[PDB]
From a paper:
Inositol pyrophosphates (PP-InsPs) are eukaryotic nutrient messengers. The N-terminal kinase domain of diphosphoinositol pentakisphosphate kinase ([name]) generates the messenger 1,5-InsP8, the C-terminal phosphatase domain catalyzes PP-InsP breakdown. The balance between kinase and phosphatase activities regulates 1,5-InsP8 levels. ScVip1PD is a phytase-like inositol 1-pyrophosphate histidine phosphatase with two conserved catalytic motifs.
Apo crystals of the ScVip1PD initially diffracted to ~3.1 Å. The structure was solved by molecular replacement-single wavelength anomalous diffraction (MR-SAD) on a platinum derivative. In this structure, a large disordered loop (residues 851–918) was located and subsequently replaced by a short Gly-Ser-Ser-Gly linker. The two apo structures of ScVip1PD revealed a conserved histidine acid phosphatase core with two insertion domains. All four molecules in the asymmetric unit of our ScVip1PD crystals display the GAF domain in an “open” conformation. The N-terminus of ScVip1PD (residue 536) and the most C-terminal α9 helix (residues 1079–1094) are well defined by electron density. Plant and human PPIP5Ks contain sequence-diverse linkers of similar length between their kinase and phosphatase domains. An unexpected metal binding site occupied by a Zn2+ ion is formed by His651 and His1064 from the histidine acid phosphatase core, and by Cys793 and His836 from the α-helical insertion domain (see below). The conserved Zn2+ binding site in ScVip1PD positions His836 to form a salt bridge with Asp550, apparently stabilizing the catalytic loop.
Author numbering: 536 to 701, 708 to 851, 918 to 1088
Write the structure that this text describes.
Amino acid sequence: KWVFKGLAIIIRHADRTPKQKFKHSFTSPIFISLLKGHKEEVVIRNVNDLKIVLQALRIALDEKAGNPAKIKVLANALEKKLNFPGTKIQLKPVLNKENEVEKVQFILKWGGEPTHSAKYQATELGEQMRQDFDLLNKSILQNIKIFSSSERRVLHTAQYWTRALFSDEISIRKDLLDDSNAAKDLMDKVKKKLKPLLREGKEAPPQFAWPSKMPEPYLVIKRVVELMNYHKKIMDNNFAKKDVNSMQTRWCTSEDPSLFKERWDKLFKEFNNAEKVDPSKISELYDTMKYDALHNRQFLENIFDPGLPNSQFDEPRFMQLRELYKLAKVLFDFICPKEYGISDAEKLDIGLLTSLPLAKQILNDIGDMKNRETPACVAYFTKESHIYTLLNIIYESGIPMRIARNALPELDYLSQITFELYESTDASGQKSHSIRLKMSPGCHTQDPLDVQLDDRHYISCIPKISLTKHLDMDYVQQKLR
Ligand SMILES: [Zn+2]
């Protein structure tokens, strides 16, 4: 009994590669010479300079006086990832009592780029929106307005979505879609509140987005470490016995078995002591699990295959792995939502400091759509943080909800929040108009180890679900402001 009139949709960026960093210190003169005489931190991101550094590793490897083992991994890492935007080196010198550089800290950082699957996710979404729009009212395509944050991965999703939907049509708005240092500090302080939750014997007293079936967070964290120590030994055994270069026929993003080993070697180090697991590193583990389960399932299966008794993770042999996945999901679903505030006031305070501008703009867009007889649509592409915080504003506004905050699925890549505007169709004029809120968790799956994947390593987007029913326009604007 309602005719569509407009949509304000906020969309999260598409799939991206995990951020990764290798750290070690060297004292050999060849390593010190790379500083070019500088006695402070030096950052190298020019591809020309990265090639120069790369050659140094080949020369340093010729001489085993230094640590050749670290040179071997670093050289491959540098050459594979120096071709990627965002790959960088940080050189932190260490000065002795005579202001002489005796050793330099070599930090190689890379990752965080949108995967080759990102274009497909955004492209599919843009086409669907064009399809849906061309069926409701073709004039809406004539009234599309797109914004994006400054981050490359966000604009990347915005660009491909806009191309698929159809002079930069995307208008970068830092004030609305970009992060603020004040709020990120608050999220960090909330992060400091998360450390005790996993330690000692807390029993998630409030909802804390925690499954009732699961034991204490300190018991769950303890079991995960046991599984990690289990699989790392399986990995080592499989490295020692099997041909690792033949465990997967396809490698994307310039990855190879060595870089794969490095990701997990770091994670295994961070997940070898339950009483030391850092809550911020729980989110790190889960992100790597999604990536490999999407882009490196073949290698993942064989490198963690516990062997035969004597093409899928569905075996009692692979039971230790599925439980590890389930336990990681639980911990990720109990930490990440709470990084944006644990208490309603914190969830609210973080909610406003981050998404106060975006919330105002959405109301204005709906105001425009109502006053303008022509339906329209406005899309905002933002990072993951704004989605949670804006969602917090929605819940903390007291608006009647159709779905509980805890019951909401993970806000994965291409997660969407919609403010669909309609008209109240009756037999009397002057329709009262109505607003309906819907959400989509994006390209997310509940069974990463059972989903059938293509060579493109891509997951379809979950359809939107209604957070509310058709609610009075003026009423929805008053609750928010
Ligand atoms: Zn891939």
